[PDB]
Every structure is written in structure tokens, then in C-alpha cells.
């Protein structure tokens, strides 16, 4: 029936936070305090769009 429209692999090529679970957990409270605005923006647009192909920026 329909066709899928997948994003290119170049757009997904982005450097990562290459850390562990314990490092993320140790600074979890301060990351959630300082960096609330972009995280909340991403969570809201993911909740209201429901499409990861449009939720990359």
C-alpha cells in the first residue's frame, strides 16, 4: 500500500554523549535542573508529533 519515508543516514550522524550509566546517574539531578528547557521542548514535540522522523532537531 503506502511507502515509508526514512531520513538519510547523514542527518542521523551526530556525535554522542559517550558515558556510562553511573556517570549519567551521578550528575542526573544537576542535568535535570540546568538543562530543563531543551529536554522539555524535545519531550513536548515528541509527545505531540508521535513521529521520530520529524523529531530530530
Amino acid at each position: 500500500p503506502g511507502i515509508v519515508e526514512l531520513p538519510s543516514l547523514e542527518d542521523l550522524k551526530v556525535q554522542e554523549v559517550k558515558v556510562s550509566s553511573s556517570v549519567l546517574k551521578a550528575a542526573a539531578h544537576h542535568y535535570g535542573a540546568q538543562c530543563d528547557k531543551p529536554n522539555k521542548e524535545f519531550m513536548l514535540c515528541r509527545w505531540e508529533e508521535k513521529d521520530p522522523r520529524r523529531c530530530l532537531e
Binding site: 549519567l24 546517574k25 542526573a28 539531578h29 542535568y31 535535570g32 529536554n39 519531550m43
Partner: protein, 70 residues
């Protein structure tokens, strides 16, 4: 003559009746001890369960903060 004979004064008294001691606390005492132990355990479990709930809430909010990157 010499023969097997009891001594001049005879043998001593020998106990032959039952002797139970009758010992331990009264039942009110063990009931009070058990009730007090119950109350102490209830209080300690109450305090530690409240502290555990606080720690679980802290861990859950750390997880919620960590979610968007994952």
C-alpha cells in the same frame, strides 16, 4: 558376729513426694512484653519504610531527569 545391718541411728529421710518448682512470669508479663515488642517493631518499620519511600522518590526523579537523552 558381722552381717549386713543398718547403722545404729538408722538411715536418713528419703524424699518420695512430687516436687514441681512452678516458675516463669505471670501471663500478663509475657503479654505486655510481646505487645511492647510489637509496638517497637511497628515504629521502627514505619520510620524505615518512610525513609525508603523518600529514597525511591529521589531515584525516580533522577530517572525522570535522565530520560530525554536516552
Amino acid at each position: 558376729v558381722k552381717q549386713d545391718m543398718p547403722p545404729v541411728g538408722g538411715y536418713g529421710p528419703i524424699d518420695y513426694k512430687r516436687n514441681l518448682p512452678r516458675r516463669g512470669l505471670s501471663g500478663y508479663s509475657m503479654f505486655a512484653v510481646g505487645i511492647g515488642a510489637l509496638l517497637f517493631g511497628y515504629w521502627s518499620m514505619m520510620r524505615w519504610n518512610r525513609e525508603r519511600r523518600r529514597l525511591q522518590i529521589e531515584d525516580f526523579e533522577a530517572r525522570i531527569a535522565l530520560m530525554p537523552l536516552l
